[PDB]
Amino acid sequence: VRAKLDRQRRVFQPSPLASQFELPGDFFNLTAEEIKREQRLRSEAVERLSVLRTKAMREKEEQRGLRKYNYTLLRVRLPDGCLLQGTF
Amino acid sequence: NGPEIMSKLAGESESNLRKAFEEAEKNAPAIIFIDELDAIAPKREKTHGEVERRIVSQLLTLMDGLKQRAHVIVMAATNRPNSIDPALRRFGRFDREVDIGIPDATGRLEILQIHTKNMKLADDVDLEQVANETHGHVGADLAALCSEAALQAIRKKMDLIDLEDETIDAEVMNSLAVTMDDFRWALSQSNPSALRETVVEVPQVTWEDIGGLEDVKRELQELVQYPVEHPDKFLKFGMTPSKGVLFYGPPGCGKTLLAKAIANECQAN
Numbered sequence: 509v510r511a512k513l514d515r516q517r518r519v520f521q522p523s524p525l526a527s528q529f530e531l532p533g534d535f536f537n538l539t540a541e542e543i544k545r546e547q548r549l550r551s552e553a554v555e556r557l558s559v560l561r562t563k564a565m566r567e568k569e570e571q572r573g574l575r576k577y578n579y580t581l582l583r584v585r586l587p588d589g590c591l592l593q594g595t596f
Numbered sequence: 597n598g599p600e601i602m603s604k605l606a607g608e609s610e611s612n613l614r615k616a617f618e619e620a621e622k623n624a625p626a627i628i629f630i631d632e633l634d635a636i637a638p639k640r641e642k643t644h645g646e647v648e649r650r651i652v653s654q655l656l657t658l659m660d661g662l663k664q665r666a667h668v669i670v671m672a673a674t675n676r677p678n679s680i681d682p683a684l685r686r687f688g689r690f691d692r693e694v695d696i697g698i699p700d701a702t703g704r705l706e707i708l709q710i711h712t713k714n715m716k717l718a719d720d721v722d723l724e725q726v727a728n729e730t731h732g733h734v735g736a737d738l739a740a741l742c743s744e745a746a747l748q749a750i751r752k753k754m755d756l757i758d759l760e761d762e763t764i765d766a767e768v769m770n771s772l773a774v775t776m777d778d779f780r781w782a783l784s785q786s787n788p789s790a791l792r793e794t795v796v797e798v799p800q801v802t803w804e805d806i807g808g809l810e811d812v813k814r815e816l817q818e819l820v821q822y823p824v825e826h827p828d829k830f831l832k833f834g835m836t837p838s839k840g841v842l843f844y845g846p847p848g849c850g851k852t853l854l855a856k857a858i859a860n861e862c863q864a865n
């Protein structure tokens with residue numbers, strides 16, 4: 509005996525008001541931490557390309573992205589402007 | 597400087613060189629510093645054109661003219677003492693020279709301390725550790741390391757306090773300390789400009805650093821120190837001091853420490 513997945517069938521109507529937003533004047537001015545982090549990532553990316561390592565070390569890093577999800581939410585965009593959503 | 601004088605047209609390079617010497621006399625006492633001497637006056641036997649040999653002759657006669665130009669000393673800088681026309685190094689002219697070389701671990705620490713005179717350092721900053729890590733670095737590189745560490749401290753703290761303007765409050769400046777992480781970051785950004793050249797230094801190895809070889813340590817003191825500590829006994833007995841010793845045997849037994857340890861006690865390079 510196992511509980512059945514609830515589809516939670518819903519239809520939505522997007523409000524045009526969600527797309528109306530203006531940025532602050534200083535939005536595009538990056539901070540010392542954001543500029544130092546970006547330059548460190550550039551130096552680390554060049555270093556990673558330079559490192560002499562075996563396949564086992566390569567897999568240990570790549571494998572970090574493999575376990576996050578086992579369910580999905582699907583949406584369908586309909587010709588009449590309505591959005592149909594459910595759980596699978 | 598060589599390349600600027602050489603960038604001039606024939607006749608202009610000689611005129612400009614002569615003017616500098618005449619101005620030094622007018623403003624005597626004066627020092628004339630010629631940078632990249634090997635570029636302004638390269639070996640004549642290594643060039644082909646008349647203009648390149650001409651400028652060497654022009655400098656050679658101007659150097660001799662210093663017997664008339666009272667209180668004028670000409671200094672020059674090159675990368676290699678044997679890359680300049682040998683005539684320049686003949687009696688008179690450039691009859692003295694000094695080997696600057698590369699600073700050692702002690703000199704590098706001194707340079708870092710000099711370029712931090714105004715900087716407020718945090719308790720975790722260890723400039724001796726930096727000086728030991730910065731192998732192959734020269735003063736130009738160590739100065740960059742200090743300025744880079746200062747800038748990182750400014751961007752982390754002060755840019756969240758001060759305006760994007762030219763004038764800063766004295767209190768905010770003095771409230772900033774530069775941490776060891778800012779120096780280590782600069783070390784990752786800098787790259788030594790003189791890593792391949794041989795570095796001559798007074799070693800820090802002492803006799804207590806060598807295990808065993810008790811008689812060899814004493815023997816080196818007899819060979820190296822006694823000829824100058826007790827010269828009257830060597831003359832009295834007509835004994836000619838040895839000029840050197842050869843070590844042989846397995847590797848990794850202390851041959852290097854033996855030579856450094858005697859150099860250390862003698863305060864020798």
Ligand SMILES: Nc1ncnc2c1ncn2[C@@H]1O[C@H](COP(=O)(O)OP(=O)(O)O)[C@@H](O)[C@H]1O
Nearest residue numbers: 805806807808809846847848849850851852853
């Ligand atoms: N007699 C010794 N006592 C203490 N340490 C030694 C001794 N011999 C060698 N070592 C260690 O071995 C290292 C290498 O010594 P070195 O004389 O440079 O070997 P090499 O013969 O390869 O030049 C030194 O850093 C030193 O710490």
